[PDB]
Every structure is written in structure tokens, then in C-alpha cells.
Amino acid sequence: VDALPYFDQGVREAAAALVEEETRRYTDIMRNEFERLAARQPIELLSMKRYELPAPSECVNNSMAQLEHQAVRIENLELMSQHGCNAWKVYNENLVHMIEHAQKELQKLRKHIQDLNWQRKNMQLTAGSKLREMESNWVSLVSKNYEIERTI
Amino acid sequence: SLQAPIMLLSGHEGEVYCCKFHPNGSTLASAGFDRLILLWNVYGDCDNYATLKGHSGAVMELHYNTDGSMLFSASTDKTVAVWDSETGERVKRLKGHTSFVNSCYPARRGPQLVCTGSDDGTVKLWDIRKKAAIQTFQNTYQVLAVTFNDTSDQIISGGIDNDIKVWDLRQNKLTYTMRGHADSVTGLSLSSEGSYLLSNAMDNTVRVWDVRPFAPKERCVKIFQGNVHNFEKNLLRCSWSPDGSKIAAGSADRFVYVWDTTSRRILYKLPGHAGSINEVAFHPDEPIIISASSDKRLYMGEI
Amino acid sequence: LICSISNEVPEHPCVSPVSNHVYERRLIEKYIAENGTDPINNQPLSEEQLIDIKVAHPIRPKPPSATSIPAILKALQDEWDAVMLHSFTLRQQLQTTRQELSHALYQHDAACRVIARLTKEVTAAREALAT
Amino acid sequence: ELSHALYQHDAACRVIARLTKEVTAAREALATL
Amino acid sequence: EELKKHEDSAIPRRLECLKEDVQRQQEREKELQHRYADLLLEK
């Protein structure tokens, strides 16, 4: 389990293969039905392709529908310019308050994680020294035990 | 930790040559030119409870046993005093030297033995029950520092002949000579394992010597510089940390020297002494230091 | 500023008092009726427990080419396309994640056995040099 | 779970790289002795 | 967070193993001297 990242400054592709070899050894209504069918088939349901084309010389209705539509647009368009003009930039200000809040959280997350990493790093250098101390003492016995036996 | 770090201790009246921490680490003995032995607390408020007289000289070297029972004092009136750690009585006074006793050391874990060295050229062995010297080694010159190994089989002795000499008790011959100091050796200390021995000398080089059955035959292991010796010609003492990790040495430029034993790097250069320093010592449990100097005062550094 | 369910910019945001997180009212109201608990923390939560937060009618201006015609035909069509193809693609993202996790764990185990096998190997080889 | 595994996998992988080179050092040492 | 916990685990146990590994090495050092020391007794 233990593998020191900060301390071990001196193989990933090799060890990945050895770990790989041990792995070789071991709620909606009707809405969901038509939505999943539309995505699976890759086909969007056709809309009213009628209003744009039409033809001069049933059309008494189509004419009267056009008139009303235009009126609505124009009244609506007029409100929208003035309404749009009033709001054309009032909503843009809201989007800047929404954006800056996300990047403040990017910083708050950035600061915690950095601290954690630093902690880990510091922690390592502690033990890597202790392991260095152990190995020096290991090599001392190794030759000490020999030099005792050589003389006996 | 105890109290607040510093805990300066006064009460002494002349120079303070020596100081030792109790084997449990709860009391302290200090001594020097005052012809007095003071027993003080290490905890609480560090206040005097016992004053121990019984000398007509300067109390050069101070030591303990490993139990914290028997207090051994080497004085400058050719005698050594043996006391009990509590109750304060003169238990055994031993007089064999014809000149000034520079240092004493008790052989630990063995039968009770004390080895002393004096200015007449003699290194003498002492059994506490016999009222007589056991073995006497005329070197030829003045001997300043004397200690045992752990096996109670050798005498490791430093003199003014620039050469550490190791005597075997069974052969009664000059076994080892250690060359490498250019001036007189003033203080020796054997480690808690017995592997290494620390030496001060007047050439201002602190040396570590490995005392082992099997030797590299040139035992110049570690060399420390920075330690200052001067015209005062004091007997400068050195000490090991309990885990052998830190090294203290007294200095004559009023700086408390503590090295790291593995990197040979000066850990601590604590100031706060007006006079030159005689002995720096480590508490046996915790990193607390008693430092003793010629400014009549003691300091408790808490690391 | 956003909703913590759909990924919207809410028109009537409401905050829950068990876990401080802003949801759009319709979407949080639907979750409580499905299963009466907070979606994120899985804590007990009801419709009365919610607290509406003033939004003062969130800015959504009506485009210049706004009529009954595009709003009925083109705009409403795009909205139910965008709902359909996103949740289908989001359902595709769940399973993938699950599979990934499973295989990751699988691979991970195999390496643990190598380390355990090599931990007995190395120290005994070092021990043999000591002997 | 994917992220914690992949990190800990390549972390546990470095245990082997270290272990293999020490095991190897024990062989030539003992062999030559 | 979890990675940090993993690192913590990684530390406690690596050292203690090497610590006990060092203790045993010291024993072989501690005895081998004595046989050398007993060479002087026969002399």
C-alpha cells in the first residue's frame, strides 16, 4: 500500500504492467419513452414548416392568421425594443455577478488542496530520512557481523 | 517540560566546574570552586533542599551511578567523597593520591569501582569496600580526564601528553594509544551504548573515538570545530545526549556548544553566560540542558 | 446563481434549511414528492421546510424576432430537443462512470498482491545478506 | 473512486520500483560474498 | 483529502518496520564485538 510520492525523487509503466497482470488474474412518465426513442433513433420531431412559405391566389384564414401574428410581433417587438432596451444590459450585469462567484470557489478549492499537498510533502521528508538512517545501520551490521567472524 | 524555559539558577559563590542530571531526571547536583555540593530540583520552582559539605578543596569532577543512589565527588584535596543521593552523609572518603585529583568515574553495571587520575602521574582504581587502591598505573605525566568502558575492563585516560591512553585491567599494560590531538586533553565522556567516546582538547578540536573490539585502526571518526580554549587553562568537559543524538561541549568563549552527531553541524550556540563555561549536560528523559560556567550561575535551556 | 439539480439559472430560487443549497422551486418540489428528502445530503426535508429567496424577476429579455409563431414552433421545439438529447446523453454518462470505477478497482487489486508478494521477497533477500 | 484509485495505483506502483531494486541489490551482494 | 489520509497511512508503518529492522541489526553488532573482546582474555 505505502508508496511515498514527495520523498521518492528517484517505473510507472513497469509497475502498471505488474498491476495489470494481477488484474488479468482476478423514473418518468410517457415523456421518457419518446425522449429516449428520439435520441436513440437520432431524429428530431418535425415542426410547423408552413408559415414561412405560403402562396398568393382556406387562404382567407391563412391571411387573417398572418395579420394577427404580425400585430402580436409588432406590439411584442415594440415592447421588446423598449423592454429590450431597458433590459438590454440589465441581464448582462446579472451574468457578471454569477460568474465571479464561481471563480471565488475555484480559489477556495485551490487553497485547501495546495495546503494538503504541502502537508504530504513535509510528512515524507520526515520518513525518507528515517529510512536512510535504517539503511546506514543495516549496512553497518552487514559488514560488522562479517568482521567479527573473520577474526574468530 | 518544566516551568518556563531558562530557569537561571544562582546560589553559587565561586566558579562552577561540574553538574550532573539525576538518572531519573528529577533533581540536580552542581559543584565547583565553592567547596560545596548543591542538590536542587529540576521541576517545580528549582529550589535548594540539600547542601553537602565535606571538602577542603575544589570539587573538580562530579558523577552519579546509574541508579541515582550514590554521589561521587572528586576534589582538589587529593581525596574522593562517596555519599548517598538522599539524606546527605559522608559515606566513604578515599585518600590515596599524592597530588590533585583531576577526575573520577564510576564503572557502571559492574561491581562498584571508581577510577581516578591525578597530577602526580597516577591513574588509580578503587573498590568502595576495601579502603585501599586496587591497581595503580603510573603513566608519567599529569592526567586530566579518566573514564571506563561499559564492560568495566578498560581505563580510558586523557592527560597532557596529547595522547589518549587505554589501559587493560587484566593485562595491566598500555593497550591503546590514540593520536590526533595537538594539545592537552581536558575531558572525556563515554556514550550510553559504549560505542563512541567524546573528547575535548586544548587544540580546540572536539573528537569522537569509537571504542570497539574490531577497529579501523585509525579511529578519527568525527571532528568538531568552533570550541575555544584560552589562557584560563580550565578543565573542559563534554557530554552525550541520552539517545546519543546530540553532543555538548563546554567552551571558554561563553557560548554553549551543541552539535548534531550525524551531520557534524552546530545545532545550538546558546548565549547568556558572562564567564567561560565548564560543563554542559543533558536531562536523561527530556531535552533539557543544565549549563555550568565560571559566572557562578546555572542555566536550564529547554529545547 | 445556478440551480443544484438541472444546471439552470433559476427564476424562483428556494433554499433548503438542512443543507444550504439553492434549487429552482419546480425541481425541488418534484424531488420532495418523489421521495421526501434533500437530494444532495439525503436528509429529511419537506415542502414547508423550504425557504424562498427573492430574485426580483430574473432578467430574461424577449428576442427581437419574437412572435407567437417562433415561440410556438422554433423555440419550443428546441427546448424539448435540448431536454431530450441532454438527459439521454446524461444517462450515457452515468453507466460509463460506473464501469470505469469497477475496472479501476479491479486493476488496483492485482498491484496490491504484487507489492505484498515483493514485500516478503525484498526484506528476506536483505536479511540473507545480513546473515 | 476512479481518481483515488488511479492515484493510489501509480503510488502503489512506485512501491514495486523501489522494492525491486533493493531485492536486486541483495542478490549481487550475497552472491559476490 | 483522502489522498492526504492515504499518505498518513503510508508514513505510519514504514518507519516502525525499519525501526525494528534496525534493532535486530544492532544485536548482531552488539554480540560480534564480545567474541573479539574475548580474544584478549585468551592472551
From Swiss-Prot, chain A:
Signal peptide: none annotated. It is found in: Nucleus; Nucleus, Nucleolus. Keywords: Acetylation, Coiled coil, mRNA processing, mRNA splicing, Nucleus, Phosphoprotein, Spliceosome. GO terms for cellular component: catalytic step 2 spliceosome; centrosome; nuclear speck; nucleolus; nucleoplasm; nucleus; Prp19 complex; spliceosomal complex. GO terms for biological process: alternative mRNA splicing, via spliceosome; mRNA splicing, via spliceosome; oocyte development; ovarian follicle development; protein catabolic process; RNA splicing; RNA splicing, via transesterification reactions; spindle assembly. Residues 91-152 form a coiled coil. The keyword Coiled coil applies. Ubiquitously expressed. Belongs to the SPF27 family. Component of the pre-catalytic and catalytic spliceosome complexes. Component of the postcatalytic spliceosome P complex. Component of the PRP19-CDC5L splicing complex composed of a core complex comprising a homotetramer of PRPF19, CDC5L, PLRG1 and BCAS2, and at least three less stably associated proteins CTNNBL1, CWC15 and HSPA8. Interacts directly in the complex with PRPF19, CDC5L and PLRG1. This is Pre-mRNA-splicing factor SPF27. It comes from Homo sapiens (Human). The chain holds residues 13 to 199 of 225 of the full protein.
UniProtKB/Swiss-Prot annotation, chain B:
Keywords: Isopeptide bond, Methylation, mRNA processing, mRNA splicing, Nucleus, Repeat, Spliceosome, Ubl conjugation, WD repeat. Coiled coil: none annotated. There is a cross-link at K217 (Glycyl lysine isopeptide (Lys-Gly) (interchain with G-Cter in SUMO2)). One of its GO terms (biological process) is mRNA splicing, via spliceosome. WD repeats lie at residues 11-50, 54-93, 96-136, 138-177, 180-219, 230-269, 272-303. One of its GO terms (molecular function) is RNA binding. The keyword Repeat applies. GO terms for cellular component: catalytic step 2 spliceosome; cytosol; nuclear speck; nucleoplasm; nucleus; sno(s)RNA-containing ribonucleoprotein complex; U2-type catalytic step 2 spliceosome; U4/U6 x U5 tri-snRNP complex. It comes from the Eukaryota. It is found in: Nucleus. Component of the pre-catalytic and catalytic spliceosome complexes. Component of the postcatalytic spliceosome P complex. Part of the U5 snRNP complex. Interacts with PRPF8. Component of the U4/U6-U5 tri-snRNP complex composed of the U4, U6 and U5 snRNAs and at least PRPF3, PRPF4, PRPF6, PRPF8, PRPF31, SNRNP200, TXNL4A, WDR57, SNRNP40, DDX23, CD2BP2, PPIH, SNU13, EFTUD2, SART1 and USP39. Component of the minor spliceosome, which splices U12-type introns. Required for pre-mRNA splicing as component of the activated spliceosome. Component of the U5 small nuclear ribonucleoprotein (snRNP) complex and the U4/U6-U5 tri-snRNP complex, building blocks of the spliceosome. As a component of the minor spliceosome, involved in the splicing of U12-type introns in pre-mRNAs. It comes from Homo sapiens. The gene is SNRNP40. The chain holds residues 54 to 356 of 357 of the full protein.
From Swiss-Prot, chain C:
It comes from the Eukaryota. Coiled coil: none annotated. The modification N6-acetyllysine is found at K120. Ubiquitous. Weakly expressed in senescent cells of different tissue origins. Highly expressed in tumor cell lines. It is found in: Nucleus; Nucleus, Nucleoplasm; Cytoplasm, Cytoskeleton, Spindle; Cytoplasm. Residues 1-71 form the U-box domain. Induction: By gamma irradiation and chemical mutagens but not by UV irradiation. Ubiquitin-protein ligase which is a core component of several complexes mainly involved pre-mRNA splicing and DNA repair. Required for pre-mRNA splicing as component of the spliceosome. Core component of the PRP19C/Prp19 complex/NTC/Nineteen complex which is part of the spliceosome and participates in its assembly, its remodeling and is required for its activity. During assembly of the spliceosome, mediates 'Lys-63'-linked polyubiquitination of the U4 spliceosomal protein PRPF3. The 7 WD repeats are necessary and sufficient to support interaction with the RPA complex. Belongs to the WD repeat PRP19 family. This is Pre-mRNA-processing factor 19. It comes from Homo sapiens (Human). The gene is PRPF19.
Swiss-Prot record, chain E:
It is linked to A chromosomal aberration involving CDC5L is found in multicystic renal dysplasia. Translocation t(6;19)(p21;q13.1) with USF2. This is Cell division cycle 5-like protein. The chain holds residues 753 to 795 of 802 of the full protein. It is found in: Nucleus; Nucleus speckle; Cytoplasm. Signal peptide: none annotated. Ubiquitously expressed in both fetal and adult tissues. Belongs to the CEF1 family. Homodimer. Interacts with DAPK3. Component of the precatalytic, catalytic and postcatalytic spliceosome complexes. Part of a spliceosomal 'core' complex consisting of CDC5L, PLRG1, SPF27, CCAP1, CCAP3 and CCAP6. Interacts with PLRG1, Lodestar/TTF2, and NIPP1/PPP1R8. Component of the minor spliceosome, which splices U12-type introns. Within this complex, interacts with SCNM1. Component of the PRP19-CDC5L splicing complex composed of a core complex comprising a homotetramer of PRPF19, CDC5L, PLRG1 and BCAS2, and at least three less stably associated proteins CTNNBL1, CWC15 and HSPA8. Phosphorylated on serine and threonine residues. Has no effect on subcellular location nor on homodimerization. Phosphorylated in vitro by CDK2. Phosphorylation enhances interaction with PPP1R8. It comes from Homo sapiens (Human). Disulfide bonds: none annotated.
